[PDB]
Nucleic acid binder design. Structure first.
Ligand SMILES: [Mg+2]
Ligand SMILES: [Mg+2]
Ligand SMILES: [Mg+2]
Ligand SMILES: [Mg+2]
Ligand SMILES: [Mg+2]
Ligand SMILES: [Mg+2]
Ligand SMILES: [Mg+2]
Ligand SMILES: [Mg+2]
Ligand SMILES: [Mg+2]
Ligand SMILES: [Mg+2]
Ligand SMILES: [Mg+2]
Ligand SMILES: [Mg+2]
Ligand SMILES: [Mg+2]
Ligand SMILES: [Mg+2]
Ligand SMILES: [Mg+2]
Ligand SMILES: [Mg+2]
Ligand SMILES: [Mg+2]
Ligand SMILES: [Mg+2]
Ligand SMILES: [Mg+2]
Ligand SMILES: [Mg+2]
Ligand SMILES: [Mg+2]
Ligand SMILES: [Mg+2]
Ligand SMILES: [Mg+2]
Ligand SMILES: [Mg+2]
Ligand SMILES: [Mg+2]
Ligand SMILES: [Mg+2]
Ligand SMILES: [Mg+2]
Ligand SMILES: [Mg+2]
Lengths: 56, 55, 106, 88, 271
RNA sequence: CAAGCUUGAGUCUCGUAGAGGGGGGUAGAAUUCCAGGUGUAGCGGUGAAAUGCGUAGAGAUCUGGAGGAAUACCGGUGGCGAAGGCGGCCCCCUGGACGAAGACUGACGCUCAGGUGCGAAAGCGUGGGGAGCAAACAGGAUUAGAUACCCUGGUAGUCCACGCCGUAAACGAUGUCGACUUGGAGGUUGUGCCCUUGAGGCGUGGCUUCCGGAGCUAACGCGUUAAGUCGACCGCCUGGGG
RNA sequence: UUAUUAAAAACACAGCACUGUGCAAACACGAAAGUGGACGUAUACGGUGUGACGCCUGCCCGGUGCCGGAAGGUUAAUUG
């Protein structure tokens, strides 16, 4: 998520651009998931539970 | 039907970081979402598309 | 006796051997009673990422109907050649001759 | 599995006409051509267990068809197992 | 093919032999034979200079081409033969002009195969080319150290050498010991590995099998008297000392390489 | 027992989708290590610490190289497989399933004691390989103790080839095969027809997910993929411990 | 195997392991020239220990040895 600062752009609008860009790009959640190993039986149990509670 | 050499079509289906956009959002049907991902992966190998941004 | 789509890219410092390289590989293919469906010299093209500290490889595409013992020897000459930096053989269902998007992108 | 013209040669060779694809002698001869052909595959690929399960279905289907043909007409059964070389 | 023997006798219980049926059952090619008489490990002073050598079967020497300089001329492999002078097998080849030579047999090579030396040869196992014409990453054997001298590295059965890098007039090789070495790029190499890779799978089974190969028995230094060995002596089983050679140099760990003129070719020692 | 028939079961023709299996190549991101450059006092770790690493120049940052393992995004109540299981890309060999219209054989079928084969992970044998992780082990903490949970290390193993083992909450805790019995909302993969623009709609097969009717059930629940109504065959149970 | 008081449980052994050695090899006999290792080349060669095979092989690096490191302290010939 590379963001360049444009002409006469304040600082707080390019901070927000950088915050908005890596929140959409999914960088903090990819790193915090990959911090510990998960067994493939635990990955399937979480995947099954997240699919069942997607019930509106 | 989808072709890896058609670069202008494939680039409407990747993000700015190069990740493949899921068909939940783009609305591609399931049979063509599988043909899109296989063809994007062939084009990445020929360096017509990137895998990432930094490279 | 199947259909193949072949892409190979060449180091740019030997880009004037490219028409010599094409017509050498053709005499091995038509000489095996295999027919040639397309042959596109794409030219120098900016790489999406560096390979061997490089950019701007020279791309050549061809579509071929041939038997398997000719196409197997084409990658031995892809492998041991120092000029080909990258190649790709794919099996095709039916022969293709319509112009590719790389010819209609000009 | 078996290719189209190698298939159609056995039907013209082993059947009553070129329409008789379903008779017992044709089905045994179509299985025998593929069973003998797959020996070259499994001499190279001993660990291919998922393909050997499909080879063993042809072996049991030929044995069931051969025991049916022997119960109906033994004179036709003796001609087929000589021509194909079965049971020694 | 490794074969186990059946325990019909106590000297046969542990014997595992290597039996290769594609070897030539017959006499070797007589114009390539020489006399080779045994030494007993004694030099021209008549003294034992290497211990534990003596006896064994009579052997004739086979002249093997380690140079491979018959360039340009193709050669068909006639048959594979047994060689008692080395661990690998040898092949008898026939050149188009009518010359016969013994080479080291590489892996996978049969009777009727075609080999060729030289700068313009093809990249296939059995061909010998200079290492500036071999792709980086290849597996080669019978590697020269000086150009024209003849092959000296990767000769034993199953051994090979990998070409790791080519920078300038030298190439870097990863030897079988784990050593990285610079060799000049004009040296020749033969494509492939050396054959007979299950030579290390055999079990001699009995003491006489070691005596048939000209290996004499080893006496432990701790089983001697103090006048004979540094380890000798004791009233019962005593050791009490640091392990050394029969000549007093600490063995079991101490490095002995002292060669300042070849040290510039060695990139990394083995580990 | 003889002679038939095509409805069961099979064969051929044309297609479709698929992480089904075996073998060989290859790519990018990241970790570790080695060499070099810049630079200087901390790094790492925790609830807090210490062990550890670091002025012999670490951590950070850039360039080059070696090597192993696994394939982000696509990615799903998705798909394939008898089950175990299977996920980057390419090629070679190869198994099954499903649809359409026909043609062919003529009950050739179902189940299956004994038998044979396949069978996660861990483990064992022989030869390799060894980045990351990590039983055992070691040290630091916590504690009344702490042979643990936490921290810093770390060997087998995890990886490959060929043999062995033959077990799992190997689970849908639901044997296989066949027929019949109201509906609703979806997913996936074929195919037919209709104004073939609007482009959209109506059918007709296969697999699959969630509700729920009769009925059944001790209840929970199951509910056309039954645990409903029936037939064929097999396996198994007979109070808790021992 | 102690010719001539000891034939054994001692020695050897196939197997196992550690260690050195890149070839003008390590090592040994030689003031040296040379020679053996070897007309061999790490699946090889030397040294050490244990001793077919089966199940195995726990904890300790404080002392001595050996491998590695170089900041620092100390330190010869030489110079004066
Ligand atoms: Mg198929
Ligand atoms: Mg010895
Ligand atoms: Mg020994
Ligand atoms: Mg004594
Ligand atoms: Mg002494
Ligand atoms: Mg003693
Ligand atoms: Mg004592
Ligand atoms: Mg002693
Ligand atoms: Mg597959
Ligand atoms: Mg540095
Ligand atoms: Mg092992
Ligand atoms: Mg831990
Ligand atoms: Mg193991
Ligand atoms: Mg059980
Ligand atoms: Mg399971
Ligand atoms: Mg389950
Ligand atoms: Mg059960
Ligand atoms: Mg329900
Ligand atoms: Mg209820
Ligand atoms: Mg009881
Ligand atoms: Mg005596
Ligand atoms: Mg005597
Ligand atoms: Mg006496
Ligand atoms: Mg006596
Ligand atoms: Mg005696
Ligand atoms: Mg020794
Ligand atoms: Mg002993
Ligand atoms: Mg020191």
């Amino acid at each position: 998520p590379v963001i360049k600062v444009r002409e006469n752009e304040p600082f707080d609008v390019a901070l927000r651009r950088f915050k908005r860009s890596c929140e959409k790009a999914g960088v903090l959640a990819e790193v915090r998931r990959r911090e510990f190993y998960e067994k493939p039986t635990t990955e399937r149990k979480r995947a099954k539970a997240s699919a069942v509670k997607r019930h509106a | 039907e989808i072709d890896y050499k058609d670069i202008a079509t494939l680039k409407n289906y990747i993000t700015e970081s190069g990740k493949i956009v899921p068909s939940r959002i783009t609305g591609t049907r399931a049979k063509y979402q599988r043909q899109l991902a296989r063809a994007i992966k062939r084009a990445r190998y020929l360096s017509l598309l990137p895998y990432t941004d930094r490279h | 006796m199947r259909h193949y789509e072949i892409v190979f890219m060449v180091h740019p410092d030997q880009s004037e051997q490219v028409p010599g390289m094409i017509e050498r590989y053709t005499a091995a293919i038509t000489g095996a009673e295999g027919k040639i469906h397309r042959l596109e010299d794409w030219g120098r093209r900016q790489l999406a990422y560096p390979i061997n500290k490089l950019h701007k490889a020279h791309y050549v595409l061809m579509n071929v109907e041939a038997p398997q013992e000719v196409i197997d020897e084409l990658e031995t000459t892809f492998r041991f050649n120092d000029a080909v930096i990258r190649s790709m053989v794919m099996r095709t269902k039916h022969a293709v001759t319509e112009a590719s998007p790389m010819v209609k992108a000009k | 599995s078996l290719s189209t013209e190698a298939t159609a040669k056995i039907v013209s060779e082993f059947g009553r006409d070129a329409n008789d694809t379903g008779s017992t002698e044709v089905q045994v001869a179509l299985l025998t051509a593929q069973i003998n052909h797959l020996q070259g595959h499994f001499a190279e690929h001993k660990k291919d267990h998922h393909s050997r399960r499909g080879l063993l279905r042809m072996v049991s289907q030929r044995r069931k068809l051969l025991d049916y043909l022997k119960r109906k007409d033994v004179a036709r059964y003796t001609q087929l197992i000589e021509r194909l070389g079965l049971r020694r | 093919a490794v074969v186990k023997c059946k325990p019909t006798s106590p000297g046969r219980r542990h014997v595992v032999k290597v039996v290769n049926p594609e070897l030539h059952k017959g006499k070797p090619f007589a114009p390539l034979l020489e006399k080779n008489s045994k030494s007993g490990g004694r030099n021209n002073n008549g003294r034992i200079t290497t211990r534990h050598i003596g006896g064994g079967h009579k052997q004739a020497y086979r002249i093997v081409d380690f140079k491979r300089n018959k360039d340009g001329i193709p050669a068909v492999v006639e048959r594979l033969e047994y060689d008692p002078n080395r661990s690998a097998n040898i092949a008898l080849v026939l050149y188009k002009d009518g010359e016969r030579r013994y080479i080291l047999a590489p892996k996978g090579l049969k009777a009727g195969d075609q080999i060729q030396s030289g700068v313009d040869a093809a990249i296939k196992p059995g061909n010998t080319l200079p290492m500036r014409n071999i792709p980086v990453g290849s597996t080669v054997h019978n590697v020269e150290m000086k150009p024209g001298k003849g092959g000296q590295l990767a000769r034993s059965a199953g051994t090979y050498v990998q070409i790791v890098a080519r920078d300038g007039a030298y190439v870097t090789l990863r030897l079988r010991s784990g050593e990285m070495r610079k060799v000049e790029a004009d040296c020749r190499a033969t494509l492939g590995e050396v054959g007979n890779a299950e030579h290390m799978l055999r079990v001699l089974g009995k003491a006489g099998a070691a005596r048939w190969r000209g290996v004499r028995p080893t006496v432990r230094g701790t089983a001697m008297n103090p006048v004979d060995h540094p380890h000798g002596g004791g009233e019962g089983r005593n050791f009490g000392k640091h392990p050394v050679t029969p000549w007093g140099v600490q063995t079991k760990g101490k490095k002995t390489r002292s060669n300042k003129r070849t040290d510039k070719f060695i990139v990394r020692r083995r580990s």
